[PDB]
């Protein structure tokens, strides 16, 4: 079980077509501070769903 020919750039490029990614597009705006984040996640400064949290 070993290859007998060289795979080309077309086989490799058509093989790597399913390895791409996409944008997150989940940025929500916190109503308290006016900063963006992910949905169901927290901000950097310490705000979640408009409610202030620990923020150490």
Sites of contact with RNA (CB under 7 A)? 1-19, 56
Report the distance separating Cα 52 and Cα 28, nearest Å: 16
17 binds other proteins, rule: CB under 8 A: no
Per partner kind, with CB cut-offs from 5 to 8 A, the member of other proteins, RNA, none near residue 29 is: none
The two three-digit tokens of residue 24, written as one number: 């997150």
Task: List the one residue from 4, 13, 22, 50 that touches other proteins (CB under 8 A).
Answer: 22
Q: Are 30 and 41 in contact (CB under 8 A)?
A: no
> Which DSSP state fits 48?
E
Minimal distance, residue 47 CB to other proteins, in Å:
16
């Amino acid at each position: 079980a070993v290859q007998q020919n060289k795979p080309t750039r077309s086989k490799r490029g058509m093989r790597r077509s399913h390895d791409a990614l996409t944008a997150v597009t989940s940025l929500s705006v916190d109503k308290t501070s006016g900063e963006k984040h992910l949905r169901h996640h927290i901000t950097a400064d310490g705000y979640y769903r408009g409610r202030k949290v620990i923020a150490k």
